[PDB]
């Protein structure tokens, strides 16, 4: 019967304990460029430019940048298909995403690694190692600390 | 030192509790007592009162001199005569709690307290 804009947002759109008050002045210095990823985290202290309830905690790509606002493309699931939605928010409600930060650091690290390896003409495997079964280990423990365990009775 | 307790402020109060005529006369008496304009109370206009400082305050307190319980725990006092005297006294450096830029609080070491207020009253 009731489906207003901020319906159901009693807890999501509430500032955390001892975290009230406007955003820090440093938030306005955050650099944003076209095509970089961004998280939509609604800041309830700023009422204008507030995103819809659904997009809180969603990641998207910047498709538009205005003087105080950002347009971001967000995937939304609508029954049998996904679709891009162009959500327009103010900069307080948006934050640079770390979703690909490991990818960027990996790109730089592998750049230098394979540069030096190709310099020394070695064929190196650069992909991530998805660690699985560990090798055998010949490990010695002082018998003064091998503790025997028995299941415990009831009290 | 500079720990001397000076009269920070002296406030005369006239609570008439009604409309003009008498309120305007109460303004006039405060005017002749001190050449500055008074200020009227609530308009739920029912009272007039004025604030004085410095030498004029000291002279008016001297005129009002004509008990050892009317002292507040924060180190102030007052009495009546019809009109009301209330003097709030403090040490120097009270500005730090009133100025805009670096407003802060004085330590209770610097606060006056009732004993010192009484001693100052007996010395003056």
């Amino acid at each position: 019967k009731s489906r207003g804009k901020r319906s159901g947002t009693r807890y999501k759109f509430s500032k955390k304990f001892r975290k009230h008050g406007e955003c820090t002045a440093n938030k306005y210095l955050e650099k944003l460029n076209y095509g970089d990823y961004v998280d939509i985290v609604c800041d309830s202290t700023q009422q204008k430019g507030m995103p819809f309830n659904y997009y809180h905690g969603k990641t998207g790509k910047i498709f538009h940048i205005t003087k105080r606002g950002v347009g971001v493309l967000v995937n939304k699931r609508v029954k049998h298909r996904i679709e891009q939605k162009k959500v327009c928010v103010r900069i307080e409600h948006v934050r640079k995403s770390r979703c690909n930060e490991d990818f960027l650091l990996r790109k730089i690290k592998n750049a230098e690694l394979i540069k030096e390896a190709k310099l020394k003409n070695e064929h190196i495997n650069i992909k991530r190692k998805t660690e699985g079964p560990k090798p055998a280990a010949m490990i010695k423990v002082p018998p003064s600390k091998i503790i025997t365990i028995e299941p415990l009775p009831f009290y | 030192v500079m720990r001397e307790i000076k009269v920070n402020k002296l406030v005369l109060n006239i609570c008439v509790g009604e409309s003009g005529d008498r309120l305007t006369r109460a303004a006039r008496v405060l005017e002749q007592l001190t050449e500055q304009k008074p200020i009227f109370g609530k308009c739920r206009k029912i009272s007039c009162f004025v604030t004085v400082r410095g030498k004029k305050a000291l002279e008016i307190l001297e005129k009002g001199l004509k008990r050892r319980k009317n002292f507040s725990d924060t180190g102030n006092f007052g009495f009546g005569i019809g009109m009301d005297f209330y003097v709030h006294l403090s040490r120097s450096g009270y500005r730090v709690t009133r100025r805009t830029r670096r407003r802060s609080k004085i330590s209770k070491t610097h606060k006056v307290t009732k004993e010192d207020a009484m001693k100052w009253f007996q010395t003056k």
Binding site: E22, A25, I91 | R101
Partner: protein
């Protein structure tokens, strides 16, 4: 009751450190440092003017995430070597300090010869925005004296004319920039009562300045500033409380 309850302290949220100290507004700050997100690498320089009760200081600041960067800096105390030995808190001193900051900034940028500013006192220049600093902005406040100094130095600092002494009075602005009001106070105090005059402007006399020389010492100062810009740990705490308890056994 107690309001300073344990629950009160548990639920208390502190202001920012600089708000608690009363230094920064934190609303004016972000309105001053916020730039359009369309503009990339647009610095938005801020002309900070802060007046202590001993001397005024001006600096050029650019906001950065790790902390503001200071690109130019001038204090009124530097006017000693430019020929003003007294009154480093005046409207005139604020003007001179702003002039110093502007000229020195332009010299550091190698832009003096292209931005000369005005001569004497009646490509686009650098743009900086005045930073208030908590002080109330009444007509005649010295922050606008410093703003006028920087505008005359050659910076473009957007401003109205409403806050100079007189709501516009260019002649009054000029006379306050040269400190004519200080000179006139000297005249009146000397004429009425010499004792108050010589107890008020004591250091002025000690500098052998003239109530007729305040002006000139500010003009030539302007020209020569244009021409050349303890810790205790748990162990000690435990031992000390042990000895304090042992003492309180006998003494009290």
């Amino acid at each position: 009751k107690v309001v300073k309850n344990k629950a009160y302290f548990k639920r208390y949220q502190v202001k920012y450190r600089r708000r608690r100290e009363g230094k920064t507004d934190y609303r004016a700050r972000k309105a001053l440092i916020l730039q359009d997100k369309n503009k990339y690498n647009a610095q938005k320089l801020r002309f900070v003017v802060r007046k202590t009760n001993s001397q005024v200081i001006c600096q050029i600041a650019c906001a950065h995430i790790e902390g503001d960067k200071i690109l130019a800096e001038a204090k009124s105390k530097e006017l000693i070597r430019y020929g003003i030995p007294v009154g480093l808190k005046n409207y005139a001193a604020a003007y001179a300090t702003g002039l110093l900051c502007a000229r020195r900034f332009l010299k550091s940028l190698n832009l003096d010869t292209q931005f000369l500013g005005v001569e004497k006192v009646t490509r686009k220049p650098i743009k900086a925005f005045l930073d208030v600093g908590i002080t109330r902005t009444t007509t005649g406040n010295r922050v606008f004296a410093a703003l006028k100094g920087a505008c005359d130095g050659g910076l473009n600092i957007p401003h109205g004319n409403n806050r100079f002494p007189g709501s516009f009075n260019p002649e009054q602005l000029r006379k306050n920039i040269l400190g004519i009001h200080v000179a006139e106070y000297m005249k009146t105090l000397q004429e009425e009562d010499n004792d108050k005059y010589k107890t008020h402007f004591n250091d002025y006399l000690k500098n052998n300045i003239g109530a007729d020389d305040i002006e000139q010492m500010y003009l030539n100062a302007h020209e020569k500033i244009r021409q050349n810009p303890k810790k205790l740990n748990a162990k000690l705490r435990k031992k000390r409380v042990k000895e304090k308890l042992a003492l309180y056994v006998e003494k009290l």
